Design a protein around this ligand. Structure first.
Ligand SMILES: Cc1cc2c(cc1C)N(C[C@H](O)[C@H](O)[C@H](O)COP(=O)(O)OP(=O)(O)OC[C@H]1O[C@@H](n3cnc4c(N)ncnc43)[C@H](O)[C@@H]1O)c1[nH]c(=O)[nH]c(=O)c1N2
Ligand SMILES: *[C@@H]1O[C@H](CO)[C@@H](O[C@@H]2O[C@H](CO)[C@@H](O)[C@H](O)[C@H]2NC(C)=O)[C@H](O)[C@H]1NC(C)=O
Ligand SMILES: Cn1cccc1CNCCc1c[nH]c2ccccc12
Ligand SMILES: Cn1cccc1CNCCc1c[nH]c2ccccc12
Ligand SMILES: *[C@@H]1O[C@H](CO)[C@@H](O)[C@H](O)[C@H]1NC(C)=O
Ligand SMILES: *[C@@H]1O[C@H](CO)[C@@H](O)[C@H](O)[C@H]1NC(C)=O
Ligand SMILES: *[C@@H]1O[C@H](CO)[C@@H](O)[C@H](O)[C@H]1NC(C)=O
Ligand SMILES: [Mg+2]
Ligand SMILES: [Mg+2]
Length: 585
């Protein structure tokens, strides 16, 4: 009755819905758990950034065994536009070998070269002004940035003066300027590309660039505030879905698609839809009494995120203004907001608490004297030790293949494993990009309103702590370099210069690391079925027809970088794949 139904209206879902409805004879229904955002300042204006407005409620982890059994709040979006509506707008591609690796795992048609036309098609880059480029060391390669696609991205039109100290200090400790971190490599420091529309200096989220932009189309239907609770089958053909009010009224509705159902419900939502619908590990489905439609042990396995560490600092001589001027100086805040309201200049074009530059580093850039020892320990250890005993052997094989790919990335000088950032205020950020740990997301019941069990298993693979500790020490080098030392920084408790051994440093880290940057992925992974995969290289769920996974649940493993740009470009690629099979215009 509709041509396609898309479960979830986040980055992937709206991108696909937009491209599919380019054909007037194709109708699409997008069912999205959250509401339409209201254009409020906390969404549209970078300096007013209020992500908590649309956090999915009531998600907590299990006790995290690698993190002193801490339990954490789980953060993921529940709103039209998905993560793009509430994210920090950091817009970065992965490195070349991220995509080549995915190909090499048994995914034909996947590589950096085949993703690049979709990176370019997805976006419009707007250059900064020349005085800001020159004063800020902003550089890019226009040949590999898109000029005509829907996602607008650019930069803030302002930087805090402390960001200069950090840039030079990063340079002094071996993180050089990167010509363009969108070119497939990002070893060193560079300006963060920001998913902002430069004509108004406001967020360019998928609600706007892949729904509002084309909302006059009568064939592009949206239904906010409803949950897809089940896929409906005729035999092994996915023919429709059931949905309920997100607010949990006792009502259920069935709707039907004439070609395909697409899952786009995110790393933490798509596996739950599959499992509720009989697609997942038969042991789980059997104990819940769910008839097995397709026995896929990979469903809900292989969860990954990019762990984060916030390090507190004090300063004897920080420079003014800085980002914390916005919270501690009511006059400075008022004058910056007035500046933004009048001529759209100033601090409010930067996402609140962030700065303008950032650094990414390979394992050997982070640990030049000991990276070979970390690789040896990771190579020596059987991949199966990172998974609970009795993990399905096919899942174990797929993880083994991921792990071998990542160990070659550890050896590669041009693939990132970590990110460092200083917002110019009282804390720095260190991101662990490529954990070897793997978690799980599993339904607890047949009740579609029940949260799944979410176990990140952060730090369970002991190599991760070795990588992360090195990332910590490189951040410490930045702050001790000459250009930062003029600002007189010192680590505050619970860190501090008196922690000098790995054990001392990681003990604190074990208490402070957050499992998650809200980058949850890889829980319906695109790997061969005998490697524990859930979707083919065309993103079709094994064992059933007319059913695909579009959201980043399908990624084999995490990028050298944050996921947003690839979430867009991957849905761009899938839209073409689907149009080809069904002869769509
Ligand atoms: C606070 C915060 C901050 C950041 C980020 C996330 C968050 C939450 N990210 C992560 C990035 O935004 C994220 O990985 C992508 O948005 C995920 O894209 P998907 O399309 O896979 O899911 P996404 O999460 O965008 O969409 C999934 C959608 O499905 C809906 N849904 C789930 N279950 C459903 C069901 N049963 N029925 C219907 N709808 C359902 C949800 O409501 C949601 O809107 C990020 N990335 C980056 O590159 N740079 C950044 O700065 C940040 N920062
Ligand atoms: C954001 O991206 C879109 C897509 O490229 C840009 O929209 C185009 O802008 C020009 C001039 O405004 C028009 O002539 C085109 O028709 C627009 N639509 C397209 C190409 O689809 C928009 O300008 C971008 N924002 C900025 C600041 O450059
Ligand atoms: C991707 N990236 C790179 C530099 C800075 C970033 C963004 N990371 C933090 C985004 C964020 C803001 N509030 C949150 C609450 C929970 C989880 C994450 C967040
Ligand atoms: C992205 N791409 C690559 C080559 C061609 C395209 C454009 N999409 C092709 C879709 C298609 C396949 N068979 C058809 C028959 C009639 C109309 C359209 C089609
Ligand atoms: C976490 O809990 C388990 C029991 O479930 C226990 O074996 C372990 O010692 C605990 N870890 C810490 C750091 O307390
Ligand atoms: C830009 O780079 C030069 C050296 O090339 C450095 O002196 C200057 O401080 C840098 N400025 C910023 C804002 O990074
Ligand atoms: C607060 O900000 C105002 C406005 O820019 C500035 O003039 C003043 O020096 C600042 N005061 C302090 C104590 O930072
Ligand atoms: Mg210009
Ligand atoms: Mg005005």
């Amino acid at each position: 009755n509709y041509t396609f139904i898309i479960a979830g209206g986040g980055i992937s879902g709206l991108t696909l819905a937009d491209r599919l409805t380019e054909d007037p004879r194709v109708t699409v229904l997008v069912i999205e758990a959250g509401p339409l955002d209201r254009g409020e300042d906390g969404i549209l204006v970078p300096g007013a950034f209020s992500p908590w407005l649309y956090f999915w409620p009531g998600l907590v982890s299990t006790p995290q065994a690698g993190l002193n059994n801490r339990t954490v709040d789980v953060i993921t979006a529940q709103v039209v536009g998905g993560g793009s509506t509430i994210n920090a707008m950091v817009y970065l591609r992965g490195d070349k070998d991220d995509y080549d690796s995915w190909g090499a795992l048994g995914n034909p048609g996947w590589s950096w070269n085949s993703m690049l036309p979709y990176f370019i098609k997805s976006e419009t880059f707007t250059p900064p002004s020349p005085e800001l480029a020159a004063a800020g060391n902003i550089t890019w390669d226009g040949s590999i940035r898109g000029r005509s696609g829907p996602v607008n991205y650019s930069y803030p039109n302002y930087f805090f003066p402390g960001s200069e100290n950090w840039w030079n200090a990063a340079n002094e400790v071996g993180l050089p300027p990167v010509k363009d971190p969108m070119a497939g490599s990002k070893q060193g420091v560079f300006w963060i590309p920001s998913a902002i529309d430069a004509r108004t200096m406001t967020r360019s989220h998928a609600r706007r660039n892949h729904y509002d932009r084309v909302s006059s189309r009568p064939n592009y239907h949206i239904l906010p505030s409803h949950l897809v609770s089940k896929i409906l089958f005729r035999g092994k053909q996915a023919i429709g879905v059931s949905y309920i009010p997100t607010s949990g009224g006792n009502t259920t509705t069935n709707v039907y698609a004439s070609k395909e159902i697409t899952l786009a419900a995110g790393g933490l939502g798509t596996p739950k839809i599959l499992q509720l619908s009989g697609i997942g590990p038969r042991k789980l489905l059997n104990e819940l009494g769910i008839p097995v439609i397709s026995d896929l042990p990979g469903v809900g396995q292989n969860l990954q995120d990019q762990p984060t560490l916030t390090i507190p600092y004090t300063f004897t001589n920080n420079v003014f203004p800085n980002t914390d001027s916005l919270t501690t100086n009511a006059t400075y805040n008022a004058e910056q907001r007035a500046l933004y309201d009048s001529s759209k200049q100033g601090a409010y074009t930067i996402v609140n608490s962030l700065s303008t530059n950032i650094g990414v580093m390979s394992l050997q850039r982070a640990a030049p004297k000991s990276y070979r020892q970390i690789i040896a320990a990771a190579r020596a250890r059987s991949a199966s030790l990172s998974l609970p005993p009795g993990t399905d052997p096919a899942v174990i094989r797929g993880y083994q293949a991921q792990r071998n790919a990542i160990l070659k990335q550890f050896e590669n000088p041009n693939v990132g494993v970590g990110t460092v950032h200083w917002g110019t205020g009282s804390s720095a950020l260190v991101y662990h990009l490529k954990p070897l740990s793997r978690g799980t997301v599993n339904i607890r019941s047949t009740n579609p309103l029940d949260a799944p069990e979410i176990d990140y298993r952060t730090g369970t693979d002991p190599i991760d702590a070795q990588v992360y500790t090195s990332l910590f020490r490189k951040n410490r080098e930045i702050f001790n370099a000459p250009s930062m030392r003029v600002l007189g920084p010192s680590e505050a408790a619970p860190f501090g210069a008196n922690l000098t051994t790995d054990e001392e440093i990681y003990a604190v880290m074990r208490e402070l690391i957050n499992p998650s940057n809200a980058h949850q992925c890889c829980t319906a992974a695109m790997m061969p079925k005998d490697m524990g995969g859930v979707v083919s290289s065309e993103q079709k769920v094994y064992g059933v027809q007319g059913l695909r996974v579009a959201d980043i649940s399908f990624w084999p493993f995490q990028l050298s970088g944050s996921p947003m740009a690839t979430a867009y470009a991957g849905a761009e690629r899938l839209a073409d794949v689907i149009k080809k099979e069904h002869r769509l215009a």
